[model samples]
Target: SSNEELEKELNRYAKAVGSLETAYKPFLASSALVPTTPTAFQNELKTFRDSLISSCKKKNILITDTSSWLGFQVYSTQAPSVQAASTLGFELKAINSLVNKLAECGLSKFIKVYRPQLPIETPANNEADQAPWTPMPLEIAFQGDRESVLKAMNAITGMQDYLFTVNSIRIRNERKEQVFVQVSLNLVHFNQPKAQE
Candidate 1:
């Protein structure tokens, strides 16, 4: 039962972790080709990994794996009302890596994000024979309790300010060119038991 609770806790962590990464705009700077291919993005990814590893180590977090999640750079912000987020840059790989570290450290139950599908956009011209982009869904899970999820989401205690933990992660490959990510977090505990059996 404790294990299950822990799993749920980690699942929340994974969701919150994903949102944390997406919240940052220009998470890391990289050559255009890096996001398109794994090999072309080596150096940038390496730098991202190193920085994230350092940060996690400081927070007593561990990274279990590095090749699970597809990283994306986006624009986002959380007003400074509750707490400060860490000094983050434009590195998607690093962002996801931090989530992995949290799981390894047992701070989160699990952080599993899928490889995103290539974005496809509307065709400029009408082509009856043109193949439409196939939809590929990206799923991420973070297992943990509400408080812990909030902790991971707010782990970075400087610069960017954010308040909230993620409970579920879902991404949709819309129009094949644009990506729409759905983030879910723990907002209420209605039927949750008072204590873990």
Candidate 2:
């Protein structure tokens, strides 16, 4: 009976680890894409924007009503709000990357990044400790076909690195060719704890 119980526990542990690895496959596969420190935010942000711009240009999708600084230049923000956000220990670069991913779904009309909230530091718990990430909401307005919009939204949330919760979606069908969509997404940023000595 003791041997049987030990074998069963080992099997259970193996199954749990397998499930975790499956869920973390994307982040593991692209570990290099994740920034190691907060200082790398600018470079990551620029790369994120460039990827979006390049993809949109290829598809002939126009990005409108965006700041010339971000739309034209491949740069990161040094604004006061950004600094304040970093004070919370959340990486804005991750949020920018998510926004870039969203742009791939349609022609961007406008994109707004709100101020990030202070980090959530909960009591000592395994789940809370593991989920050191916090939500940063973004508003995106775009023009795309129904199919494209659906596919794009699906793709955004399907990413494995972080959680993207869709707060709201409003679609206006002014023209038959393309519909305008306004979507709110809460992009997650991880604030991992320092390694224990």
Candidate 3:
């Protein structure tokens, strides 16, 4: 009995550590893409801006009103400074990369968006101690065929470079084969270290 209990405890501890490593690997990796300078960040933003719109135009994704593109740009006033630029670039990277992947599917339209909120010092759910990362909720609305949308969903989740959680998906079939999609995603950004060695 004693030996069996010790074996069980060892297995549980192993499982916990494995889960943590899986979670934190991508979280730590995302930090490397952060831009620390003004010029690089400017180009990062501009490149993301130009490439995505042009690609959407090429793909013929509907944009009846540009203002309908609410997540059209950064809110809360992003700047070339570290925090703002760091996340701005990553957010754009995150969003743009999704679009790139959805090209494998038949993406029809990309509608409104609610940009990810800035990281707060405290946990949104009040989880015990101050954590090493922030979970920013990102929302975007788009449309594609049912089959294509499912493929797009798989593609989004299949990506390993970033930690993207498909929080909620509200989908409706307004027309034959076309389904409008409102997707909520959790985009994680690790907190910057205070001082470098």
Candidate 4:
């Protein structure tokens, strides 16, 4: 009877952990890009863009355009990899943070969302089932007043949900009422795990 009770509690624990993972899919996926078929990856990209765009619209943030570059580069490796995990539910939480901050700081009117072109990295000369994780670069431009711009910058760099390092930042006084802010960020993806053959 005790063993059965323990088993029930263990089941609850497992379920709770699974729910947490689902809730924090983006953070977990950051550990390692989940390997999926090309079709699957492409589908995921579409879904990601659609959901992101929809949310941006609701937040009054406009995603003007997005593009991606090749070769998976390392952004930070002071932590562990999620190669042993699944990438089915990777979420770009940083994007959410950016949008949220822009709105909260009254900079949503300056928001221009650009979707990056993500190219899945896979081994050469092999029948691919899953693509490797590659760095995804994103560009966001907006117009803000002086204080709002400063706040936005701090919000972006200080986000705790996802790792977003500024590749380059450009700020200019475009006019009397607005300051143009352009930020280029590199979103790192996890490396592909060794084949499970």
- In the range 1-197, model 1's lDDT, one tens digit per residue, is 77877787656544543544453433212211122333334444455556655665666543344323224321112121111111112234334544443444335323444434222211233202211111223344444545554454455322232222355655454311333334443211111111234
**In model 4, where do residues sit more than 4 Å from their true spots?**
1-29, 65-105, 109-138, 173-176, 189-192
Tens-place lDDT per residue, model 4, 1-197, is 76666666556545544645243455444444455543454444455556655666676654444411011112111211333113322434345445655556656454455644343222233323332234567777777678877887788766656656688889876622677788888664444333232
lDDT of 3 by residue, 27-54 (tens): 5666444544655666665666566667
Distance from true position, residue 48, model 1, in Å?
0.9
Candidate 1: which stretches are off by over 4 Å? Answer: 1-40, 67-110, 120-137, 151-197
- Tell me model 1's lDDT, rounded to 2 decimals: 0.36
Ranked by lDDT, the better of candidates 1 and 2 is: 2
Best to worst by TM-score, what's the order? Answer: 3, 2, 4, 1
- Candidate 2 least-lDDT 10 residues: 120-129
Deviation in Å, model 4, residue 50 alpha carbon: 2.8
TM-score of each: 0.33, 0.55, 0.70, 0.50
Q: Distance (Å) between predicted and true CA of 66, model 3?
A: 5.4
* Model 2 agreement with the true structure over 1-197: per-residue lDDT tens digits: 76666666556545544556345546433222332343454554456556656766776767542521232232255422343323232334445555566666654443334432343321234121243334656565667777778877887777776566789988886332677777777755433322212
* Per-candidate alpha-carbon RMSD to the true structure: 21.2, 8.7, 8.8, 11.2
After superposition, the stretches of candidate 2 with alpha carbons farther than 4 Å from their true spots are: 1-40, 65-92, 103-132, 173-176, 194-197
* Highest TM-score against the true fold, candidate: 3
Query: All candidates' lDDT scores?
Result: 0.36, 0.51, 0.62, 0.52
